[PDB]
């Protein structure tokens, strides 16, 4: 299912694949379902236009991110099989996550129950701990960049790595131009946790400027249905002071998480 091949190579051409239905769209590329002709392996092929990548000044980010990603082997991170190119465009060979994005699940369910939410948060904390363990700090984490495996397991799908768009998930130190460390994504978990339970992120607003101020001020409120344990956890993660966010160990041990996650 996931342990295909570790020898990533660039002798792949478009003629190796039968192309299927469009899976999603982004600014630069379309992602398609695809099947490798020889093996019949189902995967997703994301197609990005080279000229657009260079024009936007992100091609170097892509080379470095691909190189990093090729090293990451983890059940809650989408596995990257390889890449190649022709004259017009650049092709990324990605794991196919059949149950789709958490974003769509949120749109379909309106909000998640504490069980879905705490399972998702455990999976994210595990994945970010693994990423942090190899010097790979993460940028923002969006429900759009969370996929679901055949058993409903979460897969981190965004390239927010290191050796923007909407800010909803960015911590103050990332938006105020301050210094940021691995604690940025702890902020991200609080934002995602809130959105999972509530159905929108804690600082959502009609305009970018309003949102900027709400994040900077940490101006958010809890609806009544949000339980005492979740309020406490979100409040621990959504701290202005990076130094005040917990370690991932502490997150995984939080009594609301331990009492609510469905992860055997
Ligand atoms: C901010 C952001 C968000 C998302 C991406 C991103 O690309 N995810 C890739 C992806 O979806 N894989 C994938 C694999 C198997 C799947 C599915 C999806 C799926 C269903 C589906 C689709 N849609 C809702 N459900 C299904 O059933 N099986 C992807 C790669 C290339 C093109 C499109 C998607 C991302 O890069 N960014 C960063 C970003 C980019 C451009 C900006 F301008 C910006 F500001 C920020």
From Swiss-Prot:
GO MF term list: ATP binding; histone H3S10 kinase activity; molecular function activator activity; protein heterodimerization activity; protein kinase activity; protein kinase binding; protein serine kinase activity; protein serine/threonine kinase activity
Leader sequence residues: none
UniProt effect for mutating residue 46 to R: Loss of kinase activity
Chain positions recorded as ATP binding sites: 27, 46, 95-97, 144-145, 158
Effect of mutating residue 89 to A: Reduces ubiquitination and proteasomal degradation
Example GO BP: positive regulation of mitochondrial fission
Reaction equation(s) it catalyzes: L-seryl-[protein] + ATP = O-phospho-L-seryl-[protein] + ADP + H(+); L-threonyl-[protein] + ATP = O-phospho-L-threonyl-[protein] + ADP + H(+)
PTM field: Phosphorylation at Ser-216 decreases the kinase activity. Ubiquitinated by the E3 ubiquitin-protein ligase complex SCF(FBXL7) during mitosis, leading to its degradation by the proteasome. Ubiquitinated by CHFR, leading to its degradation by the proteasome. Ubiquitinated by the anaphase-promoting complex (APC), leading to its degradation by the proteasome. Ubiquitinated by the CUL3-KLHL18 ligase leading to its activation at the centrosome which is required for initiating mitotic entry. Ubiquitination mediated by CUL3-KLHL18 ligase does not lead to its degradation by the proteasome.
Domain of life: Eukaryota
Similarity field: Belongs to the protein kinase superfamily. Ser/Thr protein kinase family. Aurora subfamily.
Known role: Mitotic serine/threonine kinase that contributes to the regulation of cell cycle progression. Associates with the centrosome and the spindle microtubules during mitosis and plays a critical role in various mitotic events including the establishment of mitotic spindle, centrosome duplication, centrosome separation as well as maturation, chromosomal alignment, spindle assembly checkpoint, and cytokinesis. Required for normal spindle positioning during mitosis and for the localization of NUMA1 and DCTN1 to the cell cortex during metaphase. Required for initial activation of CDK1 at centrosomes.
Protein's UniProt name: Aurora kinase A
Organism per entry: Homo sapiens (Human)
């Amino acid at each position: 299912k996931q342990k295909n091949e570790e020898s990533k190579k660039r002798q792949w051409a478009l003629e190796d694949f039968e192309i299927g239905r469009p899976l999603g769209k982004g600014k630069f590329g379309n992602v398609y379902l695809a099947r490798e002709k020889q093996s019949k392996f189902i995967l997703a092929l994301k197609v990005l236009f080279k000229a657009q990548l260079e024009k936007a000044g992100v091609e170097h980010q892509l080379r470095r991110e691909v190189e990093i990603q090729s090293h990451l082997r983890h059940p809650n991170i989408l596995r990257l099989y390889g890449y190649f190119h022709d004259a017009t465009r650049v092709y990324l060979i990605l794991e196919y996550a059949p149950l789709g994005t958490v974003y769509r699940e949120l749109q379909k369910l309106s909000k998640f129950d504490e069980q879905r939410t705490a399972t998702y948060i455990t999976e994210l904390a595990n994945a970010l701990s693994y990423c942090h363990s190899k010097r790979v700090i993460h940028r923002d984490i969006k429900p759009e960049n969370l996929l679901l495996g055949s058993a409903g397991e979460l897969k981190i799908a965004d390239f927010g790595w290191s050796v923007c768009g909407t800010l909803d998930y960015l911590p103050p130190e990332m938006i105020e131009g301050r210094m940021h460390d691995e604690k940025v994504d702890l902020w991200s978990l609080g934002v995602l946790c809130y959105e999972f339970l509530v159905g929108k992120p804690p600082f959502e607003a009609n305009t970018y400027q309003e949102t900027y101020k709400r994040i900077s001020r940490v101006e958010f409120t809890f609806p009544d249905f949000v339980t005492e344990g979740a309020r406490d956890l979100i409040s621990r993660l959504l701290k202005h002071n990076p130094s005040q966010r917990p370690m991932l160990r502490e997150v995984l041990e939080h009594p609301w998480i331990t009492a609510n996650s469905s992860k055997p």
